[PDB]
Design a protein around this ligand. Structure first.
Ligand SMILES: *[C@@H]1O[C@H](CO)[C@@H](O[C@@H]2O[C@H](CO)[C@@H](O[C@@H]3O[C@H](CO[C@H]4O[C@H](CO[C@H]5O[C@H](CO)[C@@H](O)[C@H](O)[C@@H]5O[C@H]5O[C@H](CO)[C@@H](O)[C@H](O)[C@@H]5O)[C@@H](O)[C@H](O[C@H]5O[C@H](CO)[C@@H](O)[C@H](O)[C@@H]5O)[C@@H]4O)[C@@H](O)[C@H](O[C@H]4O[C@H](CO)[C@@H](O)[C@H](O)[C@@H]4O[C@H]4O[C@H](CO)[C@@H](O)[C@H](O)[C@@H]4O[C@H]4O[C@H](CO)[C@@H](O)[C@H](O)[C@@H]4O)[C@@H]3O)[C@H](O)[C@H]2NC(C)=O)[C@H](O)[C@H]1NC(C)=O
Ligand SMILES: *[C@@H]1O[C@H](CO)[C@@H](O[C@@H]2O[C@H](CO)[C@@H](O[C@@H]3O[C@H](CO[C@H]4O[C@H](CO[C@H]5O[C@H](CO)[C@@H](O)[C@H](O)[C@@H]5O[C@H]5O[C@H](CO)[C@@H](O)[C@H](O)[C@@H]5O)[C@@H](O)[C@H](O[C@H]5O[C@H](CO)[C@@H](O)[C@H](O)[C@@H]5O)[C@@H]4O)[C@@H](O)[C@H](O[C@H]4O[C@H](CO)[C@@H](O)[C@H](O)[C@@H]4O[C@H]4O[C@H](CO)[C@@H](O)[C@H](O)[C@@H]4O[C@H]4O[C@H](CO)[C@@H](O)[C@H](O)[C@@H]4O)[C@@H]3O)[C@H](O)[C@H]2NC(C)=O)[C@H](O)[C@H]1NC(C)=O
Ligand SMILES: *[C@@H]1O[C@H](CO)[C@@H](O[C@@H]2O[C@H](CO)[C@@H](O[C@@H]3O[C@H](CO[C@H]4O[C@H](CO)[C@@H](O)[C@H](O[C@H]5O[C@H](CO)[C@@H](O)[C@H](O)[C@@H]5O)[C@@H]4O)[C@@H](O)[C@H](O[C@H]4O[C@H](CO)[C@@H](O)[C@H](O)[C@@H]4O[C@@H]4O[C@H](CO)[C@@H](O)[C@H](O)[C@@H]4O)[C@@H]3O)[C@H](O)[C@H]2NC(C)=O)[C@H](O)[C@H]1NC(C)=O
Ligand SMILES: *[C@@H]1O[C@H](CO)[C@@H](O[C@@H]2O[C@H](CO)[C@@H](O[C@@H]3O[C@H](CO[C@H]4O[C@H](CO)[C@@H](O)[C@H](O[C@H]5O[C@H](CO)[C@@H](O)[C@H](O)[C@@H]5O)[C@@H]4O)[C@@H](O)[C@H](O[C@H]4O[C@H](CO)[C@@H](O)[C@H](O)[C@@H]4O[C@@H]4O[C@H](CO)[C@@H](O)[C@H](O)[C@@H]4O)[C@@H]3O)[C@H](O)[C@H]2NC(C)=O)[C@H](O)[C@H]1NC(C)=O
Ligand SMILES: *[C@@H]1O[C@H](CO)[C@@H](O)[C@H](O)[C@H]1NC(C)=O
Ligand SMILES: *[C@@H]1O[C@H](CO)[C@@H](O)[C@H](O)[C@H]1NC(C)=O
Ligand SMILES: *[C@@H]1O[C@H](CO)[C@@H](O)[C@H](O)[C@H]1NC(C)=O
Ligand SMILES: *[C@@H]1O[C@H](CO)[C@@H](O)[C@H](O)[C@H]1NC(C)=O
Ligand SMILES: *[C@@H]1O[C@H](CO)[C@@H](O)[C@H](O)[C@H]1NC(C)=O
Ligand SMILES: *[C@@H]1O[C@H](CO)[C@@H](O)[C@H](O)[C@H]1NC(C)=O
Ligand SMILES: *[C@@H]1O[C@H](CO)[C@@H](O)[C@H](O)[C@H]1NC(C)=O
Ligand SMILES: *[C@@H]1O[C@H](CO)[C@@H](O)[C@H](O)[C@H]1NC(C)=O
Ligand SMILES: *[C@@H]1O[C@H](CO)[C@@H](O)[C@H](O)[C@H]1NC(C)=O
Ligand SMILES: *[C@@H]1O[C@H](CO)[C@@H](O)[C@H](O)[C@H]1NC(C)=O
Ligand SMILES: *[C@@H]1O[C@H](CO)[C@@H](O)[C@H](O)[C@H]1NC(C)=O
Ligand SMILES: *[C@@H]1O[C@H](CO)[C@@H](O)[C@H](O)[C@H]1NC(C)=O
Ligand SMILES: *[C@@H]1O[C@H](CO)[C@@H](O)[C@H](O)[C@H]1NC(C)=O
Ligand SMILES: *[C@@H]1O[C@H](CO)[C@@H](O)[C@H](O)[C@H]1NC(C)=O
Ligand SMILES: *[C@@H]1O[C@H](CO)[C@@H](O)[C@H](O)[C@H]1NC(C)=O
Ligand SMILES: OC[C@H]1O[C@](O)(CO)[C@@H](O)[C@@H]1O
Ligand SMILES: OC[C@H]1O[C@](O)(CO)[C@@H](O)[C@@H]1O
Lengths: 624, 624
């Protein structure tokens, strides 16, 4: 095992555990100290204003198992501190018959048991568990725990009748899944149900969704309501909130609804952020965010989706969320998005970016797997004065259109996502910032043009505004993590409406994924404009490449170049001519970003362990 | 629910939980504070000389489940003190994937991990578990924990490779069971194996048996040897120590070997007690004690047995224990005998006495189930100068015979059991003792003759020596827990060699068991004697009736008379005549015994709880 990054990579599978720990590792984002992580969980803003973030965690392993809540906190979403207790950075772990198979995703009741922050989580026990298996009632249940020390530790309710687990009966037969309770308050849903509470007797101020589906018949999001205000044991099933078909797709802009939902949440937004009105705010829109499984040929069979919904009240005192339009939260290697309320009328969303080593070839050598996305403010994106000749505009696929009275312009509404401003400000202020001169891409443009200032390592951000002709067939974008021999190309092709990440040359190491990422991006053309513009922001953080377009489209992916000098960046141009020109402006490079875990040393590995021969006997966890 | 014990019992199933807590409850013996108990476990004499006793425990329930180690200590086997920690009187409980289904029986390595007392116990996980089910490897494994505070708490080794569980591979396929590790030192077995240690490389000073069997092919006791002295992770399977046939019986004196062993142990004894020689003591005998299941039509399908064995060394460096003779440790409602070494060359044995309410009709009303037997010194019982005309003597069923050189007398050898002297001394000294005049039972004897002094409650002991003619057909014994309407009759019938406990009138409450208990007792006739003698000792302790004959035969049973005055006792006589006379002498009543738990109040119930609907979903525990 040579770690010489000035020459071609050897056989890196001969390298020891965690010998590649720092080589590809993000430094500017949320990530576990070591080992396996997946979904964000237990997210809440604490009483002191700081953010608590939990995550599915398996320390000292590089595959999933004994799944626990790891946790940390931050005052600005950006610089984090690990909790440290008797179980290291874990704060909830399998410990009881009802959750011994895994402490799965959960969400926070801010004023819960005895007034304390309280988590409702999926407690798993033995038996087949999965949407493609024959799962039985009891394998996935929902349980409570509360914290008296602001998330340093959690106390579970006792096991038994009238205690944990608090939700165990399947609301319908033959479920594909029954997990990921999302607890939320909703003046909107309270107002809608107020005339029917005699039918169900459920009058509490908290709702909870549980994610699942029905074998052979598509995904389901089940709605529960807290039976009585101030009491947290009894939750009453109202009915299915979202019902989709077996591998149903709303189309090219909307992924696929698969066979089962995971990590679903419910929110209400307006142009400024979170909306807490009862329906009276005409600018507010109800949204569901949700993962789906088995509706995708790649990306671990997982789509992270969202839908705008219109609520209807059923005669039995339940709610049907009718999908109005449907989109994708991130088009790349991310999943398990969670959202949570933040002071100042905000709803903040964060997901999990998995590695691109699906055959587990170099995972042990890493000594870790996974990171978070950046934290994102959700809001209703409104585009005014949109031209009716915008191609495909009235398909209204992942957006809505409202015509002006005279029919000559359109207002477009969709889900907006932008990186939280605290992170952008901290990144910029800690970086060496190069404001770059605008670049006109025409007949003289090379395929690749390095920026006039270059990054110094694998931790940087780029921004640019690409102005295209309305009938362009030119392509342009950014190349990142680039040397002569390794590079990753981010292209936008307005003619096809496709944003791609080409990774055929991303790394000399051949075991990592190299498939082309793809997102659809609608450039809403503005009335009177003779051009259309793509604002593209790119974060490069170790191996993470996280792309944002127009405060709307997100695409997270991975690149693992071996060579030490595969850190360069610049502009890409294809088919730019004297006549078909691409004007690039607002160009800026931020080199360095922020050290997100300042108390951690560079190498936080504690080694890796094997569960031994019993792992295969129990059949629950891979064991490593 | 009336608790009026001066009139006939009502419908006691209407009574609330623990309303009958004190009514039938033993006071003079080891018993949990409340709830369910079964097998003794984790028995050892601590460094300060006191006795640690563990037991299988399920607090606040009256059926088995979440099985844990409850514990207490005593300086004299007789007066006990509960441990009190974060889990009450529990000291080990299900907490890890490998033992979440139950912390089953285990035994003590006195100088174990880091020099501390260490328990090797059966750690159970999910899956079918039982001799009549299709159990799979991994469901029962063996794990270690150690104590740094003399049994107040135990620290388990970590889960994983080279740690817990330490024994997990089945030594043969298709096991009926794989549990109850019994760890012991044996100069005898070390000497026998010393010439073969190159074959196995196992050279440690601790052995361990594991109890089980093979489907369709009878019970097995598997022998392991610690691989290396001072190291406790690696245990090497040598081979089967005891192999018996599917429902094989050695005969009328020996119960039945069933299909699977439980709670088996290995010891070596001589006439004084425990023997720790290498084979050089010609008075010493090797013994195995073991429970069997599914070889009995009643008594919960459980025989608590013992066998004298002769060890042979196999060519592969293992030991075959060849059964020389085979007996019964207790003939009544007891099981799960454990034995442990005690200072002064002693081996002390104690078992579990179950209730006689197999349909669980009044268990909730009790608020508890189960007690221990008394603690018993084991030794080799030797009877000298036995007459060769003793009927059935040369069948040598649960004893051995050695003829004198001249053939006119026999030395009989068998397993001896007697109540530990500390308990007899404490009982006697705390009781009101009545030494009774001898009673000749002849033609004038009534069926029942009350003693001249009577007990004052349900806590007393009786002794008597019954001298019978060599050709008697008379029966005699003791009646206990007696009023006019309720009584329990203990008869010996020398002609049939049967000791019986007739319980047809034991209680007016009809839901308790009323079947006749039966033990075989051999009166070894002495050369020159014109009579044969039965020394009978009886302990009455709440509902327990525990009978000892001749420091050899034990029979534990239950009687639950309702009436407050069903406490009397006296002599029984049947077929005594002028010619066929029974001389009773050495008669003594001890009224009161000892308060075995002086710190406990009379009612230590904490109420009972239900596990809720998930108990049936998990399918592991009854739930109550
Ligand atoms: C199989 O068997 C298993 C083992 O028995 C069993 O698991 C156990 O289940 C029981 C029953 O559910 C659990 O007991 C509960 O414990 C809760 C506290 O849990 C936390 O703290 C304990 C104890 O912590 C001490 O000890 C540890 C270990 O040494 C130390 O680390 C601590 O620092 C602390 O040490 C101090 O105290 C010790 C004595 O206790 C001293 O010895 C020591 O010197 C120190 O001074 C921990 O062990 C727990 O850890 C475990 O669990 C966590 C998850 O929670 C895991 O992460 C971890 O790994 C461990 O597994 C944990 O940290 C109690 O709060 C709870 O008590 C209440 O509930 C019951 C039932 O409702 C009531 O009877 C009782 O009154 C309590 O309720 C009152 O209080 C709460 C909160 O204040 C109120 O909300 C409630 O309304 C009520 O209020 C009442 O009083 C008020 C007056 O003040 C009044 O206003 C109200 O009106 C009202 O009247 C309960 O005791 C036990 O934790 C489990 N143990 C383990 C190891 O798992 C398992 O379930 C079984 N399985 C099956 C299938 O049956
Ligand atoms: C799923 O996830 C689960 C959760 O992660 C996981 O379970 C956990 O597994 C880990 C790994 O096996 C366990 O970690 C071990 O813990 C042992 C100690 O366990 C006891 O103590 C802990 C901690 O106690 C503190 O905290 C509690 C809770 O708050 C308090 O109640 C205590 O009072 C105490 O509090 C103080 O300390 C805190 C900080 O720790 C402070 O915050 C606090 O303020 C106080 O000051 C308890 O939690 C345990 O309780 C649990 O387990 C018991 C059963 O054991 C249950 O009954 C109970 O309900 C709980 O479930 C328990 O009481 C450690 O000893 C052990 O440490 C060693 O082993 C590793 C690996 O070999 C070594 O790396 C390490 O060095 C240690 O070994 C050394 O020391 C031992 C003994 O001294 C030596 O024998 C050994 O040779 C070695 O010596 C070395 O150093 C010497 C120098 O001194 C030198 O001479 C030698 O040569 C050598 O170099 C390990 O940390 C953890 O307990 C589990 N937790 C739970 C909750 O279950 C589970 O397995 C996962 N499942 C799967 C399937 O993966
Ligand atoms: C005295 O001690 C007990 C603990 O032993 C304690 O708790 C009670 O425990 C008993 C069991 O001993 C429980 O009985 C079961 O109840 C089930 C139905 O329960 C529902 O209705 C009840 C009556 O209105 C409610 O009280 C229950 O509420 C509690 O539980 C819910 C969770 O569901 C919780 O949200 C609440 O807060 C409460 O805690 C609940 O709504 C029965 O289904 C169950 O069924 C059987 O048992 C009977 C007796 O054997 C049979 O007659 C039935 O046919 C059936 O059993 C069958 O046979 C076997 C059973 O193993 C099986 O093979 C068959 O399929 C079939 O099941 C049972 O009756 C009782 O619910 C529970 N009460 C509680 C928790 O309040 C007491 O509280 C304690 N008393 C005091 C004063 O402290
Ligand atoms: C680096 O980090 C690892 C943790 O990841 C850590 O521990 C090692 O972990 C690996 C797994 O990553 C273990 O590999 C397995 O080993 C099994 C055989 O193990 C036996 O032989 C070893 C070699 O001599 C010994 O080291 C082992 O001793 C340990 O464990 C025993 C308990 O058994 C214990 O008493 C000792 O004290 C030691 O702790 C042991 O005697 C293999 O069976 C297992 O099998 C597969 O994996 C391969 C790679 O994928 C495949 O090539 C095989 O075909 C096979 O996998 C197949 O595919 C899948 C697997 O999921 C399945 O469907 C098929 O049926 C089939 O199984 C595997 O190779 C390794 O044993 C373990 N080492 C330990 C604990 O020492 C390292 O220690 C750490 N390094 C450092 C320096 O810290
Ligand atoms: C980068 O490193 C490679 C290999 O060490 C070398 O070919 C070249 O000089 C360096 N710069 C490039 C390719 O831009
Ligand atoms: C990181 O630390 C681990 C654990 O000490 C060690 O095994 C590994 O070699 C280290 N890796 C590097 C690259 O420093
Ligand atoms: C309410 O009605 C809907 C639509 O028929 C149904 O799916 C749901 O199960 C009902 N809710 C109940 C039975 O609680
Ligand atoms: C919703 O709120 C508006 C004003 O904020 C109020 O007029 C209306 O009555 C509310 N709707 C309900 C609660 O029915
Ligand atoms: C919206 O505007 C377009 C273009 O003017 C027109 O084709 C369409 O019919 C309009 N829709 C409505 C509902 O008026
Ligand atoms: C650098 O980052 C830290 C941590 O996020 C932040 O608090 C600080 O404001 C940043 N420095 C600047 C903007 O100069
Ligand atoms: C074509 O592009 C080059 C490089 O940006 C620029 O110098 C030149 O002025 C452009 N041509 C025109 C006609 O703008
Ligand atoms: C653009 O993307 C779609 C998938 O949404 C694909 O079918 C089409 O071939 C792509 N076209 C080009 C030119 O990249
Ligand atoms: C015992 O009590 C019963 C019922 O109260 C009564 O018949 C009798 O007087 C008492 N004594 C007996 C039967 O020896
Ligand atoms: C014993 O105590 C328990 C728990 O407090 C109580 O429910 C029960 O009625 C008591 N029984 C008696 C006979 O005192
Ligand atoms: C040793 O031999 C006996 C008798 O054949 C056998 O039962 C046992 O399994 C053997 N021990 C092994 C294979 O370790
Ligand atoms: C057993 O012990 C005796 C004396 O106690 C000794 O003579 C003999 O050599 C020992 N047997 C062994 C260890 O082979
Ligand atoms: C009474 O019993 C206690 C506890 O076993 C014992 O220590 C004491 O010696 C006994 N009293 C006597 C023999 O007088
Ligand atoms: C017969 O028994 C009675 C009662 O023990 C006794 O008084 C009498 O002396 C006995 N008869 C003979 C002949 O011993
Ligand atoms: C004595 O016991 C045996 C069982 O061991 C039984 O078969 C026999 O019938 C009994 N005989 C009498 C007279 O009780
Ligand atoms: O780690 C388990 C968790 O991960 C998910 O499967 C999402 O990928 C959740 O549905 C579940 O709670
Ligand atoms: O409680 C479980 C324990 O009880 C037994 O079955 C004996 O009756 C043991 O074999 C086991 O360890």
């Amino acid at each position: 095992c040579s770690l010489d990054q000035t020459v071609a990579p050897g056989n890196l599978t001969l390298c020891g555990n965690a010998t590649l720990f720092t080589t590809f590792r993000p430094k500017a984002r949320f990530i576990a100290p070591e080992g396996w992580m997946n979904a964000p969980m237990g997210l809440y803003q604490r009483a002191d204003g700081s953010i608590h973030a939990g995550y599915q965690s398996h320390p000292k392993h590089i595959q999933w198992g004994n799944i626990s809540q790891g946790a940390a906190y931050s005052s600005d979403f950006t610089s984090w501190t690990d909790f440290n207790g008797s179980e290291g950075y874990k704060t909830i772990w399998p410990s009881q018959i009802y959750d011994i198979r895994g402490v799965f995703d959960g969400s926070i009741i801010k004023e819960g048991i005895d007034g304390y922050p309280t988590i409702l989580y999926t407690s798993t026990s033995f038996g087949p568990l999965g949407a493609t298996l024959n799962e039985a009632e009891g394998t996935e249940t929902q349980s409570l725990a509360y914290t008296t020390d602001d998330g340093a530790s959690w106390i579970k309710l006792g096991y038994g009748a009238g205690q944990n687990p608090v939700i165990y009966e399947w609301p319908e037969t033959n479920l594909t899944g029954f997990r990921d309770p999302y607890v939320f308050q909703s003046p909107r849903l309270e107002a809608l149900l107020a005339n029917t509470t005699s039918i169900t007797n459920a009058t509490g101020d908290h709702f909870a969704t549980i994610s699942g589906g029905v074998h052979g018949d598509g995904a389901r999001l089940f709605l529960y309501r807290q039976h009585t205000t101030g009491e947290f044991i009894k939750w009453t099933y109202l009915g299915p909130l979202v019902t989709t078909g077996y591998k149903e797709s709303y189309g090219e802009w909307s992924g696929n609804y698969g066979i089962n939902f995971e990590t679903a949440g419910v929110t209400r937004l307006n142009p400024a952020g979170a909306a807490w009105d009862n329906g009276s705010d005409t600018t507010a829109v109800d949204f569901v965010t949700f993962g789906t499984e088995q509706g995708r040929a790649d990306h671990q069979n997982h789509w992270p989706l969202w839908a705008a919904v219109d609520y209807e009240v059923r005669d039995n005192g339940s709610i049907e969320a009718v999908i109005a339009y449907s989109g994708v939260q991130d088009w790349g290697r991310s999943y398990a998005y969670a959202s949570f309320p933040v002071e100042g009328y905000r709803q903040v969303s964060v997901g999990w970016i998995y590695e691109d080593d699906d055959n587990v070839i170099l995972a042990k050598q890493f000594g870790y797997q996974g990171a978070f996305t950046l934290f994102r403010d959700l809001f209703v994106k409104v585009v005014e004065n949109v031209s009716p000749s915008t191609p495909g505009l009235f398909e209204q696929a992942s957006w809505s259109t409202k015509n002006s009275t005279d029919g000559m312009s359109v207002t477009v509404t969709t889900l907006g996502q932008r990186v939280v401003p605290e992170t952008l400000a901290a990144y910029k202020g800690n970086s060496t910032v190069s404001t770059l001169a605008p670049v006109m891409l025409n007949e003289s443009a090379a395929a690749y043009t390095p920026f006039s200032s270059q990054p110094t390592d694998r931790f940087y951000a780029l921004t640019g505004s690409f102005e295209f002709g309305l009938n362009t067939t030119a392509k342009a974008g950014f190349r990142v993590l680039a040397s002569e021999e390794e590079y990753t190309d981010i292209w936008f092709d307005p003619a096809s409406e496709n944003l791609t990440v080409v990774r055929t040359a991303s790394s000399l190491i051949k075991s990592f994924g190299n498939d082309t990422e793809l997102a659809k991006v609608k450039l809403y053309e503005i009335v009177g404009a003779e051009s259309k513009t793509l604002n593209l922001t790119v974060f490069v953080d170790g191996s993470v490449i996280e792309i944002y377009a127009n405060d709307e489209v997100a695409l997270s992916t991975r690149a693992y170049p071996w060579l030490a000098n595969s850190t360069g960046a610049g502009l890409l141009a294809d088919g730019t001519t004297a006549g078909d020109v691409v004007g690039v402006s607002g160009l800026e490079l931020w080199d360095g970003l922020v050290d997100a875990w300042p108390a951690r040393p560079a190498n936080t590995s504690q080694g890796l362990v094997w569960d031994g021969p019993t792992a295969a006997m129990y059949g629950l966890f891979a064991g490593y």
